[PDB]
Design a protein around this ligand. Structure first.
Ligand code: GTP
Ligand code: MG
Ligand code: MG
Ligand code: MG
Ligand code: MG
Ligand code: MG
Ligand code: MG
Ligand code: MG
Ligand code: MG
Ligand code: MG
Ligand code: MG
Lengths: 115, 212, 51, 416
RNA sequence: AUAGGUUUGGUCCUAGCCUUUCUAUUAGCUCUUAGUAAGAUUACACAUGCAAGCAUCCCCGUUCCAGUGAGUUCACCCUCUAAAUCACCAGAUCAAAAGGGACAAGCAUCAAGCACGCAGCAAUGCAGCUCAAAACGCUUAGCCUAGCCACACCCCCACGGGAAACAGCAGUGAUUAACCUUUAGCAAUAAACGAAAGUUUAACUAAGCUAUACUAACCCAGGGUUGGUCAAUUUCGUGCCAGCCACCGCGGUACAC
């Protein structure tokens, strides 16, 4: 389908079954469907803890670098995954959400102590 | 393989092109605002909530330049948003002006100037963006020296930043593999990157225009 | 709000630097594979073997 | 295993709560019942039994069931009498007690519903309410005038005179009756009419009798079931609830229930489907017994042996009640000897390609009562030689049917 | 195919038909639970509700997602090179228009098409080009499925006209043997927008209905068949009638009804 405009994006395509999410890190044209045609599958991501309490993420770092060079954008979840991986800096929103969680738990603890 | 030619397609395409060209709306129509309901009558689309106060209480660039000889050519024009969001002098030099002559009061138009953002003057003149925006103010001839007298800040910015953990590890491992045993820390140069503030004017030349 | 603005500024600076580096690496790889010593040596070897 | 869903046992005295009254305005043709209803609602033949939830100046709410007065709609009048709990008979003293007036009186007697006489057109000359009461004496409606219980009210629906007294009498009789019903639990009601809207599907205008109806309920009636999809009023505005004695139009009907059928709420869609299957199986057993007797007769005959002027009619109506009325008029045919009348197919809805195909197959005529036939249907009918006859009035349609019967022959059948 | 039944008075050969296997739709009879998957027959007509905003005004998007299969060798390869991304450029990626090649099924009782070619700068000249190795023509079909092509009410197109558009989600009438909710939230991913917190999204997610299927369970089993092919019938009733059969066949006082 001849798309006007658009641009490559490295993003998560949701596969899996109901109640069982699973993501394929695919470098795809942004206008293309979420789970549709993709230029290249750069990795995978299982968001459910496995028997060892792990969320397995596989990042084809070489091709990810090649596509970032070739001019592909990064969706926010992919940016946060890379930030956790240390391939990127931690996302400003990850940091701010961590601080928000710290403040929220602090309020909860303070109220529990008071009551 | 040869298909029946689609003559009507081309006919309609050219006709629509000509109609658009000949009926392109005028700035007076595109940038007209209903101060009572805060909607643009031409399209009937409300303006963002945050801009209501400015629309009600501030004047446009050509609105100011309608009360100046040569339409204020050669004067410095500033913005309320810039004045609020910065301490350094922010203003355009306003080399050229072309008002919207059909306007009842000539308060819409198209301007060209040289920007002085945060006290750094560009090396050329280019078009003024956000002319239709309601946050504008005129720099008076007097007090202009006080306004535009700026003392540059030191340019000591971090030339390099640490690599992200994993990238640094990979770089070091690759170097050791190659054979070098130098312990110099990998660093990421950031001088080639200049972080323009998010309110730096864009290129009105490439900015598009609303259609009819 | 201010802290987040500063964080985003620094983050985008660093990410743009990284993206510049990756773009440079991609360009260098393609440049090499196209017109590098190894590639030209292989081409010349093929031509000489053919002759 | 019997899976039928039956009406819940009579409500407990404690569970009982006051409810509105249900009034049916019966009477013979053109005695101003429609005018009286319009005056009460603050807003020339009736052909539909219409339910309206009116609010009186006292603040009370009363459900009025305006019924047709024509002789044809005896079924509609009987259904209205059965569902309602008060019969405000309307009689024009100038015209006097008539055949349909007596029919309504008998229906009220059967239903065991208090009757209130409203003398209509009392403004006009020759109006003799005393004579009306006297004549009613013969038909057992002993007006309070002649030492009785029935309240007679002189009114002039056109001029709106004494209607306040009529409403006051109705309210007083309602309070005396002390009508109450359980507002909670599974809903119970009766279908007042059913039809097919091109937008809303199969709809049924019903009157709730118990419980409260709400969107998402599962209802069963006859061989039909529904998941209540849209509950609407006379004016179509959606209503979130339908308390007892509330007229409500219910959408979401999988099948079009027969008029007057009981609607009972069940637990779930699977339970409703089980109930419908069981009811269909019961009907199948009954029809199977009938067919078994017929087949046994035929087989005995075969074993012992081993030892034209016909009018085919398709009927399409706007509502099931209208279709039933036309069917009764047809069944009153008695001149089969000179010409036979055959009913190929009856249904509710605009003339459809299936109706046209049946007409073509049986050389039939389509009679559409208050229904349309799109230009596509008209073109197909012209192409296939079918004749569509769209009538908006029952007696006009009956006249046309008689004319066709004579053309086949005048027809000896008198509708009466 | 590991084959079987069937031509005949009988054998052999050829041969069609049917059986056995596996799916899918519909129908009859019947049915307990949980998880998942899939789900109008129709390019016929649509009530109603929603499905595109964002944002300090401009711009950007609403050309995407989503849908249907009417039409149908526009999909794949190469050449060239638009638009878009790579904060600017860089060449890199992506991919249009154009040009070259490849590209469904049947009908030859569709065998001729009728300008379908070439040269010349031009003028103009030559009379050529496709075809029994299937041209031209008719009918049918969405395809080569990480998905792709095509259509977007019809007039191929859509200035113009007919007319007032669900082939977006839910739903409806008609139609067919064929028939899912007129649910909830953007919490996750995707998209749009913004510098950003964030907002929007009938995409999507999580639910609703359906033995259509797979998995698991069930302490309440129905359906079909019982002459042979083909697992499996006791006694009655009927008596070439009623009836039964996928093929062979049965029923004239029955392991076939
Ligand atoms: N003079 C007079 N006329 C009245 C009065 N009330 C009603 N009418 C008229 O009498 C007629 C009554 O007929 P409707 O009630 O409309 O109809 P109907 O009784 O169903 O009769 P059909 O529909 O023909 O069976 C109408 O013309 C009314 O307007 C009244 O009080 N006085
Ligand atoms: Mg009337
Ligand atoms: Mg079945
Ligand atoms: Mg097709
Ligand atoms: Mg022939
Ligand atoms: Mg349509
Ligand atoms: Mg079109
Ligand atoms: Mg739909
Ligand atoms: Mg339907
Ligand atoms: Mg189905
Ligand atoms: Mg026997």
């Amino acid at each position: 389908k001849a798309y006007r405009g658009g641009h490559l994006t490295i993003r998560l395509a949701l596969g899996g079954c109901t109640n069982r999410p699973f993501y394929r890190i695919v470098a795809a044209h942004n206008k293309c469907p979420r789970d549709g045609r993709f230029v290249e599958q750069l990795g995978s991501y299982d968001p459910l803890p496995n028997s060892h309490g792990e969320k397995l993420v596989a990042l084809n770092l070489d091709r990810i670098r090649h596509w970032i060079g070739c001019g592909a954008h990064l969706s926010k979840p992919m940016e946060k995954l890379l930030g956790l991986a240390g391939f990127f800096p931690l996302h400003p929103m990850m940091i701010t959400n961590a601080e928000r969680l710290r403040r929220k738990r602090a309020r909860e603890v303070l109220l529990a102590s008071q009551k | 393989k040869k298909v029946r030619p689609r003559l009507i397609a081309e006919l309609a395409r050219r006709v629509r092109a000509l109609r658009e060209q000949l009926n392109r709306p005028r700035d007076s129509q595109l940038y007209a605002v209903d101060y009572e309901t805060l909607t643009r009558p031409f399209s009937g689309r409300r303006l963002p909530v945050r801009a209501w106060a400015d629309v009600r209480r501030e004047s446009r660039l050509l609105q100011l330049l309608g009360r100046l000889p040569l339409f204020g050519l050669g004067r410095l024009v500033t913005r309320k948003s810039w004045l609020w969001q910065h301490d350094e002098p922010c203003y355009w030099r306003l080399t050229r002006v072309r008002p919207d002559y059909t306007a009842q009061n000539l308060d819409h138009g198209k301007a060209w100037g040289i920007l002085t953002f945060k006290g750094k003057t560009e090396s050329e003149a280019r078009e003024i963006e956000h002319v239709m925006y309601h946050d504008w103010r005129l720099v008076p001839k007097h007090e202009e020296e006080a306004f535009t007298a700026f003392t540059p800040a030191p340019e000591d910015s971090l030339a390099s930043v640490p690599y992200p953990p994993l990238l640094r590890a990979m770089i070091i491992a690759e170097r050791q593999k190659n054979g070098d045993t130098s312990t110099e820390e990998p660093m990421l140069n950031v001088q080639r990157i200049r972080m323009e503030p998010w309110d730096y004017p864009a290129k009105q030349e490439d900015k598009g225009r609303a259609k009819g | 709000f201010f802290v987040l603005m500063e964080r985003y500024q620094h983050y985008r600076q660093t990410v743009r630097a990284l993206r510049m580096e990756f773009v440079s690496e991609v360009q260098r790889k393609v440049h090499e594979a196209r017109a590098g010593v190894l590639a030209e040596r292989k081409a010349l070897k093929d031509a000489a073997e053919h002759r | 295993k019997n899976k039928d869903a039956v009406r819940r046992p009579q409500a407990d005295p404690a569970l009982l709560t006051p409810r509105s009254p249900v009034v049916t305005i019966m009477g013979h043709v053109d005695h101003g019942k429609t005018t009286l209803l319009d005056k009460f609602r603050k807003t020339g033949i009736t052909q539909h039994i219409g339910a309206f939830l009116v609010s009186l100046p006292s603040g009370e709410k009363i459900t009025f069931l305006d019924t047709p007065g024509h002789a044809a709609f005896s079924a509609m009048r009987a259904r209205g009498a059965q569902v309602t709990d008060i019969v405000v008979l309307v009689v024009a003293a100038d015209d006097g007690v008539m055949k349909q007036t007596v029919e309504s009186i008998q229906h009220a007697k059967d239903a065991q519903v208090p009757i209130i006489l409203a003398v209509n057109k009392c403004d006009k000359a020759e109006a003799d309410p005393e004579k009306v009461k006297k004549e009613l004496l013969a038909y057992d409606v002993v007006c309070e005038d002649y030492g009785g219980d029935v309240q007679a009210v002189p009114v002039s629906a056109l001029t709106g005179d004494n209607l306040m007294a009529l409403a006051e009498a109705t309210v007083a009789l309602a309070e005396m009756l002390e009508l109450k019903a359980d507002p909670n639990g599974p809903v119970e009601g009766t279908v007042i009419e059913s039809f097919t809207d091109k937008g809303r599907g199969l709809v049924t205008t019903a009157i709730i009798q118990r419980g409260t109806l709400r969107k998402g309920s599962v209802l069963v009636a006859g061989k039909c079931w529904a998941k209540v999809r849209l509950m609407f009023d006379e004016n179509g505005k959606t209503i979130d609830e339908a308390y007892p004695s509330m007229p409500v139009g219910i959408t979401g009907w999988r099948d079009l229930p027969s008029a007057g059928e009981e609607i009972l709420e069940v637990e779930s869609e699977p339970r409703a489907r089980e109930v419908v299957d069981w009811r269909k199986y019961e009907q199948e057993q009954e029809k199977g017994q009938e067919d078994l007797k017929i087949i046994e007769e035929k087989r005995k005959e075969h074993k012992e042996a081993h030892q034209s002027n016909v009018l085919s009619v398709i009927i399409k109506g706007d509502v099931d009640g209208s279709v039933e009325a036309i069917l009764n008029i047809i069944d009153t045919y008695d001149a089969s000897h000179e010409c036979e009348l055959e009913l190929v197919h009856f249904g509710v809805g605009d003339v459809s390609a299936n109706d046209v195909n049946l007409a073509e197959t049986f050389d039939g005529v389509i009679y559409g009562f208050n229904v349309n036939a799109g230009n596509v249907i008209q073109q197909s009918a012209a192409k296939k030689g079918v004749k569509i006859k769209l009538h908006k009035i029952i007696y006009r349609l009956v006249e046309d049917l008689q004319e066709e019967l004579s053309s086949r022959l005048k027809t000896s059948w008198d509708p009466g």
